[PDB]
From Swiss-Prot, chains A, B:
GO terms for molecular function: alkaline phosphatase activity; hydrogenase (acceptor) activity; magnesium ion binding; oxidoreductase activity, acting on phosphorus or arsenic in donors; phosphoprotein phosphatase activity; zinc ion binding. This is Alkaline phosphatase. It catalyses: a phosphate monoester + H2O = an alcohol + phosphate. Keywords: Disulfide bond, Hydrolase, Magnesium, Metal-binding, Periplasm, Phosphoprotein, Signal, Zinc. CDD domains: ALP. GO terms for biological process: protein dephosphorylation. Its cofactor is Mg(2+); Zn(2+). InterPro entries: Alkaline_phosphatase, Alkaline_phosphatase_AS, Alkaline_phosphatase_core_sf. The active site is at G102 (phosphoserine intermediate). SUPFAM superfamilies: Alkaline phosphatase-like. GO terms for cellular component: outer membrane-bounded periplasmic space; periplasmic space.
Amino acid sequence: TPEMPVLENRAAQGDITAPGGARRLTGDQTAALRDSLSDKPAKNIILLIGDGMGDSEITAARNYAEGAGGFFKGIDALPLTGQYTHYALNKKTGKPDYVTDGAASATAWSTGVKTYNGALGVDIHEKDHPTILEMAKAAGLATGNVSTAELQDATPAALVAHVTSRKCYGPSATSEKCPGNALEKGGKGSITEQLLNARADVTLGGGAKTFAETATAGEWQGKTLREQAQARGYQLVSDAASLNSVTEANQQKPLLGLFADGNMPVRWLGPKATYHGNIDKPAVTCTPNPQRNDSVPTLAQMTDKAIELLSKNEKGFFLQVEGASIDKQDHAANPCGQIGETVDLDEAVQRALEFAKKEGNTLVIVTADHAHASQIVAPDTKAPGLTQALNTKDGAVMVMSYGNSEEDSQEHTGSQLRIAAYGPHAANVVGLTDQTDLFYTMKAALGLK
Amino acid sequence: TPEMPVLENRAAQGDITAPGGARRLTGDQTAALRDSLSDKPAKNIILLIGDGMGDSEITAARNYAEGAGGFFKGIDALPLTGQYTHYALNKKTGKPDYVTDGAASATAWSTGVKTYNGALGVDIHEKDHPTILEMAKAAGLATGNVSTAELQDATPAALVAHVTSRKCYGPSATSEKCPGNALEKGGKGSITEQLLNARADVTLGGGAKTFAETATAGEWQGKTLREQAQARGYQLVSDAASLNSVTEANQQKPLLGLFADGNMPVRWLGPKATYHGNIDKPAVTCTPNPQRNDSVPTLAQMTDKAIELLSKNEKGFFLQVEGASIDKQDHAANPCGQIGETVDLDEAVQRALEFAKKEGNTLVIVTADHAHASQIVAPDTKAPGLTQALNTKDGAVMVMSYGNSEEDSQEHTGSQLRIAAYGPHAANVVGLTDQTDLFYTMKAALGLK
Ligand SMILES: [Mg+2]
Ligand SMILES: [Mg+2]
Ligand SMILES: [Zn+2]
Ligand SMILES: [Zn+2]
Ligand SMILES: [Zn+2]
Ligand SMILES: [Zn+2]
């Protein structure tokens, strides 16, 4: 029944200076909560991942774009919540590695088995395990993979590739870093080659550059990975106009959208945080990114078309969407770039719920692969790292700190983080769980075996 | 019905290197969750605050004392979870201050009205508003206030004092910083004086030192605050032995335990984090604190006696327990001191749930006032701040970083953080809520007006 509620408005109710004015709740949630619980099987699953979107990343984005008492229409409107752990494993010893990377974590929600950082679709012994996209496809469901990063990147790759090192993008690199994976050595092939092999119905993102390499062995040996895609019946799109034109995407006519050479461009602009930037520099106000060409589709646009095409399959669909640069910008210590991307992920989460709400059998999940560096500190702060002051929507200054790395790249962190869901089987994300339970939650919802 | 479950075992189910081995869930939670939902009124309420206990603080403690795949028998066993916001207000402008202190936040969950940092029980206008402990007492319910910090510190004081500055501990300071509060100027009195006025049934913690001042005005002017307590029917205890002897604590015979001049001592020892400590210094293994005399009671012991005493009142009770030094040690950049205290709080949370489980009408809440500085980073990290390497229970190294302040004290952070509950009306903590909603959830559960 379309009787399961999405959080309507969790914004502050009134005057935050007045008693009860900062409240986000209007009444008791006991009933509404009872109405969100359902162990009926999910027909569809949309999994939204914001790379590096820890609770801290979620708070700074809200504080700035919607103000402290604000509310993310998408990101915050999911009724059921919990916290989950995402530690990885040390390759040699098999003990825990408290801070995972994009590859070991992505692998965990995809296969349900922990692995060492850098691995994609294999356990610590180097044995392959089937991904949820692969199991979806086998049962007859439709499949989609959407991201704002190069399709070869860890997060989207973890669903279609089984390599020993995330560096094995296309043919050349594979030969050198994943020899037992290289096609000419009789391996399954590079990440790019295994993606074309996988043949999901809809694949959208960046990474057009690796597609320029020519394979070394196999049927298409000699031909660039791009000619092969063509040669195998893939529809190729490079912009919004083209994307808007596709009316079908199935096994006979799978869709492949390559919107950028490398990663798709970020939405906002802002300088990079600096030492004492909060006390030596004026407050910043993010502005749109000039280089972002009007033709490059947005995550929400892409999520919209994907869901439109995929929902045709009467059996069902599984889709994974990732706002990839929150993390990348968090690594670069660029508050504006980071917040812009969280806002961008929120627009897509809204499209997800919209469909969810009116269909009634879609399970939607929103979370991140791990926590990151960014911190929200006081304005008078004298930090050892990189800081910047922002003018928020509250019309107040907000200071952000990056202080875990003194190298050119800010580092991930291992704190447990938020996981939120809405729909059939959402109860399984409440409480403390582990990134791997997610794999199991999905599989059970769709009734895969 | 005692049919409402607490989370049994959320530890990894088996071999974490194996498929399904890291899972924390055994089945579907939809039913178990349905059985945790109840809008029946709560007869009692126990509120446990870990000062500065952000998700990061909880992860590190677990990683160390229980290992990555571990599970806090108390802190992690609460079935319903959410994330809540705790921003404060700028005094002048009344706009949000994204990073609150111990006072503004404590005031928020006590009165339900946001305030500026430093304030205890008054809004930005300086108007007093009633605390949840006060409303409890008026309804006839029994009340208790437990903490390991000076009873005059922000967290426990926010429940019984209405001053303009948290610095107004006893008579002297009040006269100079809260003149319009000073007893001699016709004010309600210093924090300490207002505490003895409040007359909760059970009050345990530190801060014996301030009780040595003599009041300036009123009926007991001339007499030290201690003689006054005695003069007003207060039982005074200073250690375990003495504490174990009380068999009654009511309005006629209220219990006041002062177990330390300042803050009670921390449980573990370990050196302080240092610049490149993780790379220039050997891994650390915390050890018990030599100075912690065997006679100073522990948080769990105190929670145990208090609940024992308070549960006599047939009408009900309201209790607040605080593990205060997680924050203090977090400020001091001492990983062992911080982790020892979280474990200590976990023991109390266990004692809380034990009662809850068998009584059936108690609502238990475990959360923090705000997030803090500590981060869990990679072993080879080269950070600008303070780091240290620990040998966890997994027999692996874990590195912790402190890098938001270059002053002698590490700073708070403003990330939304976990809030977990078990019992009647626990549904109101799921999803995104604000620290003030907590004031309203408790009041409605106990049916206060
Ligand atoms: Mg990614
Ligand atoms: Mg405190
Ligand atoms: Zn990542
Ligand atoms: Zn990263
Ligand atoms: Zn605090
Ligand atoms: Zn503090």
